[PDB]
């Protein structure tokens, strides 16, 4: 799944790759589920989709915390912006 | 770029979609630049890749804070896990 | 995301499409997470990956039950084969 | 077709991957056949498409049962939700 | 799924399109199932994969017959080569 | 092109893979050409596209006969459905 | 199949697009068949693959001639290079 | 980028593969550039797109000539159809 | 385009046409250069190398168009192109 | 991610591949961000998308300068066309 041969990648880079691709996939599921929630015409399906959507958000947050704890720039940049109140830029 | 027709999607669902795909694309850049930092045999190139990598993390962090502020479950789940101690699970 | 124009599709066919593609995406996550569990060299990440894997199984099971309740041949075939003993064929 | 190198995967993981990808592909045929069934304007084709659709559902059910027999969490989560009444999110 | 807009396609062209992509997908399943059958190390799964494989061949054959009945050049070319005996590049 | 590593695939499985992906690719061409035949506004091009469409049908037919000769379930199911009359799903 | 909306494309541009992608698809078949001919271990299959390879070349040549007749600079550049002797550059 | 293992491919097959994919990519650029030419509303951009378009045609023609010189059936079939009059089929 | 053309400004769409063109020429530059290294036929190698370097030229032309038509492209290309010393 | 085997590629070819795909990806982000900037109906998001858009341009320029320094034909052609006046096709 990597762009460079594993041969040249440090173990920490590959573990971070595993986490990053996990966040990406959960983010995608969040988005597609939210779209289906809006478009669904069956309320029983809509409740299932909306539930799965919100657990995908939890999966992403758990993996993002792992990245925060194992990558200094992630911790630094996440600390600057997350859980703030003023204008983001 | 959306999976359901825009006509059935709420405005704010589409704006969250724009933010989520942005975070996904910045996450992909972080992973790919990080792999290329490891594999590059040109130090001047490596310094550029590393700089771009870490700015992609900042772009992800800003856009993520926007998601947190505009989605009740992103705020709940991010609050649960980010900058915590002890087992993420 | 549909192969035929929404004008010619029954509303229920589109709802079933929303469910099928959700299950497919959950199955993909189960598989990918399980492969990352085997390959991970960080025990914390492995624990997150395994947790997300097993919740993806739950999401699939939930959505599959919706299909079962909303499609006569899913109900027939799932009842023939699930929770059985002896050769599946 | 695996995302991690086969050297690091347990044999059982790779066999479950084979089953999972099989279920995914049968589900996709189910969805596409059903959409084609709605859109077809040839009755003889529609009958073939609907026949193939419903056998794809059967292939998926067979492979899902194998997964249930070979994975404790699949067996648990399928047990909880399949063949129930009432809200699924309960 | 079509490469040209539906407005310019004849209805029968679109029906043949539906038949063709079905056959393609059944063929893809035949091939992947057979590879997984070779590679599987679990005999219970292998029996399932092989059963699904051969049912996919049936799905392809059924849809192929529909194409044969609804397209004269399919009928011509399938008649030239199927169920023959000699070298195939000569019939 | 294979979904499992070559070192676990039997040679005959890989040859059938080569034949199957060939039929799939010719089928794709038949469909795409036929759609372009409907949409084209230049008659000289249309005649070329149709010629190519129908030669793609022949390529698929030749390769299908190889499959029939090299796989007993292809032989069985194709014999059941090709060149028949009456409902296809009842043969 | 077009990258710009059909309503802004001239009709001649769309016909050339039909021809160009046909040549591309036939070129791909020539290449893929030639690789399979080299790799095949069944002589009866190989003869079929090679027959189809060389017909895909004929299809490409035919379609390219239509393009040549319908595009002034296809005609000019093909006339410059085809059927020459000496370094192509 | 080849479909069969390089170990079983003949040297000439791999070189023709490099030439064929090059012709394919130049043809694609001709088509996409021509579509952008029709749709562009900036005259300076349009001039660049058309200029690059006609050079991609020259690149394809050069590479096709190499194929003609290095493949007897390309030579036969191009000779049959290129620079002719009357019905191509 | 990733958003509907009806919500996009006309200049935005023209910059899209330019950006995707540069991207496709860059990809050709990269693929041609890899093929130049791997080619075992001398006349082919010369064609690939010629096509490679013309794609670079196409990219340069289309980038200049962007520079003339986007103030941030002009600023950032002015900051870094043709400089001495560390790029970061 | 290379199309030829790494064995046969010169090291500078692989490093230029790393630079080129980086530029492509930053360019893609410039384009997608700008289209999202046009289409966004939330001004706080728009400000983020637009800031990110303009930093992608800087990333592209930095990497392009590296290519210019490491490739004579990039240096030649960029010198011909960048920061000029008049018809671009003629300089
Ligand atoms: Ca605070
Ligand atoms: Ca990207
Ligand atoms: Ca996914
Ligand atoms: Ca499929
Ligand atoms: Ca056998
Ligand atoms: Ca094809
Ligand atoms: Ca023929
Ligand atoms: Ca391209
Ligand atoms: Ca125009
Ligand atoms: Ca030039």
Numbering used by the authors:
A (entry chain C), B (entry chain D), C (entry chain B), G (entry chain G), H (entry chain H): 7 to 95
D (entry chain A): 7 to 96
E (entry chain J), F (entry chain I), J (entry chain E): 7 to 97
I (entry chain F): 8 to 95
Task: Copy text from the publication.
Our study reports on a new class of ferritin-like proteins (EncFtn), which are associated with bacterial encapsulin nanocompartments (Enc). By studying the EncFtn from R. rubrum we demonstrate that iron binding results in assembly of EncFtn decamers, which display a unique annular architecture. Biochemical assays show that EncFtn is active as a ferroxidase enzyme. While EncFtn does not store iron itself, its association with the encapsulin nanocage suggests that mineralization occurs within the cavity of the encapsulin shell (McHugh et al., 2014).
Through site-directed mutagenesis we show that the conserved glutamic acid and histidine residues in the FOC influence protein assembly and activity. Analysis of each of the single mutations (E32A, E62A and H65A) made in the FOC highlights the importance of the iron-coordinating residues in the catalytic activity of EncFtn.
